[PDB]
């Protein structure tokens, strides 16, 4: 027959702090046992306050990002303001569900700030079930990224650690570390790591090289 889907890999990670949000991904686009390109970062600026990360079928991820872009403009002409992080996350849920019977093979994570300036992270499934959380990973290597974050950020399975609040510095290394680990095991993860930092000042991008095999 004919399959409307392809698997292109990519893992996306988001973490929430007091006044910052982190959205990070690998730069590898692949298909089968071949790499399409080594220069495909999954982070995308939507507003100065909100950044999205899409992974899975790149055809769906591209069209979906363009839908969101158009929908962002539609909102602002109609409402006279920018669509907030929580509003974008709410809108994304509905867009993904309108395709409940022909879904976007897509894993979306939203990172930004809420109306109080506090860090916000939203994790989605291909069909639009979502919630807010401190940290979440989506994509081919999400199961590799999750447990380490559960232990270190959530302080899970530990007895007398004093429970230190999350700092930007520490989260940055944490983001770097989990991807370094995943690139060693997941064949779909590698090449380079791009981190997008959302703060009150705006969006700053940072690049750290990864395994290229």
């Amino acid at each position: 027959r004919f399959s409307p889907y392809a698997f292109n890999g990519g893992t996306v990670l988001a973490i929430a702090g007091e006044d910052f949000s982190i959205v990070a991904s690998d730069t590898r686009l692949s298909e089968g046992f071949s790499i399409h390109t080594r220069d495909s970062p999954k982070c995308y600026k939507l507003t100065d306050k909100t950044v999205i990360g899409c992974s899975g079928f790149h055809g769906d991820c591209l069209t979906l990002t363009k839908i969101i872009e158009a929908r962002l403009k539609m909102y602002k002409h109609s409402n006279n303001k920018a669509m907030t992080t929580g509003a974008i996350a709410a809108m994304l849920s509905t867009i993904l569900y309108s395709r409940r019977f022909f879904p976007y093979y897509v894993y979306n994570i939203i990172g930004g700030l809420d109306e109080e300036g506090k860090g916000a992270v939203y994790s989605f499934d291909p069909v639009g079930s979502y919630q807010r959380d401190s940290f979440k990973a989506g994509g081919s290597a999400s199961a590799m990224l999750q447990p380490l974050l559960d232990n270190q950020v959530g302080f899970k399975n530990m007895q007398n650690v004093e429970h230190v609040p999350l700092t930007l510095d520490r989260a940055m290394r944490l983001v770097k570390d989990v991807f370094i680990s995943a690139a060693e095991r997941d064949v779909y993860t590698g090449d380079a790591l791009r981190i997008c930092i959302v703060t009150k000042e705006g969006i700053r991008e940072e690049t750290v090289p990864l395994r290229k095999d």
């Binding site: 392809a6 399409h36 220069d39 790149h58 055809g59 069209t63 022909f102």
Partner: protein, 216 residues
């Protein structure tokens, strides 16, 4: 298209200093059979962007006419605006995904080469809507054979002269002919530059069959 009839194999792309060069062999296969050994799988969209296409040839000729008319329509207005290589790439991406989402795909893989504003363009388009940009491009079996060659050279030498790109391309067509059962030894080279699009006539890659005597 549910089942493609006449197909074309790998299309090549790589960008040199001051332009882009595209290669595709002049073969249209009907299954394993070499049916048409002198047909063009490349077109000049306008004077800034060019296109080579893999997969179903009837779908390529259809897309060739639709894109052909779009360029004509734009030339009629004469408002100082024309389609950039990125604009053609974006349109094609939107076209393929749309057709794919209606479960009636255009059975093609595309390489779009272009030159505009002193910058070289090379974009990939899939039949499912997979789209990206890369310094070198190879579709079908090229992605497994020619693409490794291009990347290994571009790692050692990122900027190539037009001559260096040409000889690299001829070298890749040599590998493709040896290794692809759905290939042929008649091919074309397309080039974008400050001067525009130039498609060159029937070319053959030099072959060597001396290893045929190295089995004793």
């Amino acid at each position: 298209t549910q089942n493609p009839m006449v197909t074309g194999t790998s299309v090549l792309g790589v960008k040199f200093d001051g332009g882009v060069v595209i290669a595709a062999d002049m073969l249209g296969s009907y299954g394993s059979l070499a049916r048409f050994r002198n047909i063009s799988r490349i077109m000049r969209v306008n004077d800034s962007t060019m296109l080579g296409a893999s997969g179903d040839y009837a779908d390529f000729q259809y897309l060739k006419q639709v894109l052909g008319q779009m360029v004509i329509d734009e030339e009629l207005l004469g408002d100082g605006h024309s389609y950039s290589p990125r604009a053609i790439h974006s349109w094609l991406t939107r076209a393929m995904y749309s057709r794919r989402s209606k479960m009636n795909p255009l059975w093609n893989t595309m390489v779009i080469g272009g030159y505009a504003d002193g910058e070289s363009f090379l974009g990939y388009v899939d039949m499912l809507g997979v789209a990206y940009e890369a310094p070198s491009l190879a579709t079908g079996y090229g992605a497994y054979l020619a693409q490794p060659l291009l990347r290994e050279v571009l790692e050692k030498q990122p900027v190539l002269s037009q001559t260096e790109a040409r000889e690299l391309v001829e070298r890749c067509m040599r590998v493709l002919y040896y290794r692809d059962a759905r290939s042929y030894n008649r091919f074309q080279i397309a080039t974008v530059t400050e001067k525009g699009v130039e498609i060159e006539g029937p070319l053959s890659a030099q072959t060597n069959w001396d290893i045929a005597h190295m089995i004793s």
